Amino acid sequence: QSMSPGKLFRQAVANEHPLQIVGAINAYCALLAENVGFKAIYLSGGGVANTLGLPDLGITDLHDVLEDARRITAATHLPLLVDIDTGFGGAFTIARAIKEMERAQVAAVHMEDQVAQKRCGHRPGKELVNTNEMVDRIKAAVDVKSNDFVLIARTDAYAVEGLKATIDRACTYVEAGADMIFAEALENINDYPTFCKAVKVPVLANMTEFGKTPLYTAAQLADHGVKMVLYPRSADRAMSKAALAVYEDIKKHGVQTASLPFMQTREALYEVLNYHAYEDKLNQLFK
Amino acid sequence: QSMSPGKLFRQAVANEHPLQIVGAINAYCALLAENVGFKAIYLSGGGVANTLGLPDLGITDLHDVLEDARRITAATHLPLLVDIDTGFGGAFTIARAIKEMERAQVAAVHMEDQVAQKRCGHRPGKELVNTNEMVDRIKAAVDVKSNDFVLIARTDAYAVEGLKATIDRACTYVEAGADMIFAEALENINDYPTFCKAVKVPVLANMTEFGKTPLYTAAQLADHGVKMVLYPRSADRAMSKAALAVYEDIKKHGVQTASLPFMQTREALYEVLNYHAYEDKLNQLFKR
Amino acid sequence: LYFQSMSPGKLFRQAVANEHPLQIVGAINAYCALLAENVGFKAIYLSGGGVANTLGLPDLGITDLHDVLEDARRITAATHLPLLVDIDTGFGGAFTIARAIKEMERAQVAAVHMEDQVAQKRCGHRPGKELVNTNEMVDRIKAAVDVKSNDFVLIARTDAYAVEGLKATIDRACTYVEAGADMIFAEALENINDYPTFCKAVKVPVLANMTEFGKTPLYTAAQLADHGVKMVLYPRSADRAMSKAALAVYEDIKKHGVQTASLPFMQTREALYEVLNYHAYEDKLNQLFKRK
Amino acid sequence: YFQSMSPGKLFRQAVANEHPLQIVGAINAYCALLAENVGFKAIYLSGGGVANTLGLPDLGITDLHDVLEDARRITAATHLPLLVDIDTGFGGAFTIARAIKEMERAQVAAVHMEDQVAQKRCGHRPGKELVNTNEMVDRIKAAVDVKSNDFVLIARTDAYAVEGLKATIDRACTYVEAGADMIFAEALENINDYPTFCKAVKVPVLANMTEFGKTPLYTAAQLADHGVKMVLYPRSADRAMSKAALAVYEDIKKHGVQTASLPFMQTREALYEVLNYHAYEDKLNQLFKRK
Ligand SMILES: [Cl-]
Ligand SMILES: [Cl-]
Ligand SMILES: [Cl-]
Ligand SMILES: [Cl-]
Ligand SMILES: [Mg+2]
Ligand SMILES: [Mg+2]
Ligand SMILES: [Mg+2]
Ligand SMILES: [Mg+2]
Secondary structure (H helix, E strand, O other): OOOOHHHHHHHHHHHOOOEEEEEOOOHHHHHHHHHHOOOEEEEOHHHHHHHOOOOOOOOOOHHHHHHHHHHHHOOOOOOEEEEOOOOOOOHHHHHHHHHHHHHOOOOEEEEEOEOOOOOOOOOOOOOEOOHHHHHHHHHHHHOOOOOOOEEEEEEOOHHHHOHHHHHHHHHHHHHHOOOEEEEOOOOOHHHHHHHHHHHOOOEEEEOOOOOOOOOOOHHHHHHOOOOEEEEOOHHHHHHHHHHHHHHHHHHHHOOOHHHHHHOOOHHHHHHHHOHHHHHHHHHHHOO | OOOOHHHHHHHHHHHOOOEEEEEOOOHHHHHHHHHHOOOEEEEOHHHHHHHOOOOOOOOOOHHHHHHHHHHHHOOOOOOEEEEOOOOOOOHHHHHHHHHHHHHOOOOEEEEEOEOOOOOOOOOOOOOEOOHHHHHHHHHHHHOOOOOOOEEEEEEOOHHHHOHHHHHHHHHHHHHHOOOEEEEOOOOOHHHHHHHHHHHOOOEEEEOOOOOOOOOOOHHHHHHOOOOEEEEOOHHHHHHHHHHHHHHHHHHHHOOOHHHHHHOOOHHHHHHHHOHHHHHHHHHHHHOO | OHHHHOOHHHHHHHHHHHOOOEEEEEOOOHHHHHHHHHHOOOEEEEOHHHHHHHOOOOOOOOOOHHHHHHHHHHHHOOOOOOEEEEOOOOOOOHHHHHHHHHHHHHOOOOEEEEEOEOOOOOOOOOOOOOEOOHHHHHHHHHHHHOOOOOOOEEEEEEOOHHHHOHHHHHHHHHHHHHHOOOEEEEOOOOOHHHHHHHHHHHOOOEEEEOOOOOOOOOOOHHHHHHOOOOEEEEOOHHHHHHHHHHHHHHHHHHHHOOOHHHHHHOOOHHHHHHHHOHHHHHHHHHHHHHOO | OOOOOOHHHHHHHHHHHOOOEEEEEOOOHHHHHHHHHHOOOEEEEOHHHHHHHOOOOOOOOOOHHHHHHHHHHHHOOOOOOEEEEOOOOOOOHHHHHHHHHHHHHOOOOEEEEEOEOOOOOOOOOOOOOEOOHHHHHHHHHHHHOOOOOOOEEEEEEOOHHHHOHHHHHHHHHHHHHHOOOEEEEOOOOOHHHHHHHHHHHOOOEEEEOOOOOOOOOOOHHHHHHOOOOEEEEOOHHHHHHHHHHHHHHHHHHHHOOOHHHHHHOOOHHHHHHHHOHHHHHHHHHHHHOOO
């Protein structure tokens, strides 16, 4: 208990091979992930926007993300990695973002080298800031962060500038104070061993679906020197399909009978929540 | 539309036979429901608590619910019914709840006759306030609410006091100013026609799964005099199963291949969000 | 009976029309808004600098929509008095601006002001301000007007006088009105003789910002009205007095081990109860405890 | 000033090293900064302040979120240990637990929770209703069961005016037994009550020196001599702030200009000093001198 969220995350990176980090859009999903046995969870920036019905276009601000993060960390001590896009503004905003995330009991954040009006890392038409501007971002963050807290610098540079230039950026970023590196949308697993060796610090691979990356296995990615594997939206995408199906079912058939087999049971829900321990205490109070 | 949220809800109750109201835990789910063609949506109190990882035991307050409601109404004008439990406190809290819900562009709320430390309406061991205390609650709410805004009084009395006593309560509640009635956990469809006739105002039936009620159809419930049918957690329950499955898959197999067929596609997601209209405008700005 | 059936935007437009000129006073919180209402002001203001400073942050565009929105909601919950809200430069691009407008409307806000500075903005009476070109500001205004209701008031603010001079500032303001701005906020005009020419050229109602310790002399409402100004803003006046008073109480308690010396400078419990209508509530509470 | 210490620890240390510890109310972060600048060692978020600032009466309408939001804003701006009013705990055992956990997460140093019924009122008003000793012990158990060690739970008793000194001491003692760290002796009307109260309860005692209530305003020294360890000034600054604000508004209304108010305003430069504004705007000009 008395270990800091940052420390828990660093320890999960070290002891797992590799550490699988799964996205959760809300506290209950975080609980499901914990129950399944994952050692780290993730708050997706795109998830934050999409869940509000907004596109992933840097419309959201620190408060949209912070509120979602707080809800999660209130429900579980499982170390949480939070997407903070490009830091929500200049040096002062970045400092605020870091301080606030720490205050919200967050374990780690990732900040990237795109320009302000950012987009999904697997989409075309991304624009990057120069190495210097990103170093500035990193300095603002490290200047105010605690030791244990993990800053993951994310580079979106591979698809635009190629492997060599990307490694250069990552190395400068580590130099500037980044703890770990998020190598976004490396298209070939053979890139990783050379990337991981050059940057030295733990590297995260983003195994998102419907992107520019093939879906490799955790084992494969570990063998190529990767320390963290991210599943940013996987559960959310399944959740949406399931929800739509229930709605269609209710609309078409005037009843949800057909959906019942696809629903988690009341008892399983109670299990995840520890509901019975609470209602029992409530009946003892009522007598 | 230039019609108020309350009016939109009243109109949906009148024009549909019956009005199906589906639960949504977040704005995106509300969008899915809208796309499918529902005329009204619902914010479940249990949903609000459970999503935060809390039991449905009246731990949540006005702010927990209000925040979830605001997020939804920001994304859709589809009239929203919001669960406000027992009103979160005394007369003044109830007044605040009503005012705040109106300010959040909510169409209707439901408030129930349980004691403060409330529970799911399909669980055993429920305790009710007397008829007088509930009338007090209703007065506090009606005293500050606009005309169009819909106050649904919910009675949890059937399982404890039986149908006759429940109808009595509901009738007093309508008298005190309730617009509509939420008849919680009526176990038999033959109860409804007598209930609906006695209370006169539109009645909501709660078709929740894994409770004390059989799952009747909308048509059946309409034939028995019911005007609204609620599906409070249906989508949420499916969402949770789907999510757990993805997590298990990723854990066991080190990859999500097996899950792919069970995922909504990027393009369908973009469709629901209108994503393309935004990213196109973004490319036109970068070309200038 | 106007408070009841009229939209916040409409209430603000009506206050601008019926007053000569409309004095708009800053309030940092709901209680201050109530004090202003009690004194008889027809419109109130949420200062962006106030929002930041009250959190202990500098007025340097660090704050986001949520910082301002939360403060605004608290105020509009307590009073129907039309509220003007400072939204800086709109908190981001076209989509953020749209969100800001929609959210402010949802928060029962009457009007906002958005300005032509660059993202990392500063106080309008400080040196070293940087502006976006006319085109970029028109873009901002379009994003806002495209989503706003009719009644809701968009005040375009130009910070251009100190940088580009009166002529260039009038040009900007006129383009801004053309792009859909309802009213104009002429920031930090140094001389009262600037106003009549400014007001005539832009046609729409003009706000003059009578902030202390700035680049403007403190003219009177009457004077500013005579020079064609329709709104006069007192953005931080109360806040500045509040801070001095608070510091003094703290010093007093520190030095003397008791607050005796401060008592004469405190609003009384009874005056507080009056502003809140406290008695009406506690009376109803005793009647509820008596039947139970 | 070094921050490897938990907020609870900082508060306990301030109680021990000061004689007595003056705790001043601040309604917002900026006020907290003013208090810090003046040299106070602990600050306070008033529940009545939270309600009143929203334009609501102090009648238990506010919930955990109203208070939590105000507390977060303060603790973001200063490490100065903050004592937060949590009324009666906002609900049952589970709500209390949530309140405690959330307050800790918000970097709060200490809370005070009282023995009134749910629909509570100002402790210096007539017509207060208390829960029995058992119900309050329940409240305290719910809180202590989830709180960290360093975090300070101050049990407040509102019982003096209703049940008298002896019954109040009994309550306080049971409360300490149930796990309370410190005691808030609300609205003792006479300074001669304190030495007997403080001796009986043993744990540090807070005296509430609020104006326009049922208590005379004694000095810190006096209260210390009578065995009191903390002295609270819950609304003092707020009351002065309100008067000052009203006066500015009257001035602007009557005279069409704020000239008469200028002498009563903190200067731009003093404001900049409290905020460290110049350090930020200077860095901003150095950044603009490349582009
Ligand atoms: Cl926990
Ligand atoms: Cl919408
Ligand atoms: Cl009001
Ligand atoms: Cl700090
Ligand atoms: Mg992202
Ligand atoms: Mg419910
Ligand atoms: Mg401003
Ligand atoms: Mg209090």
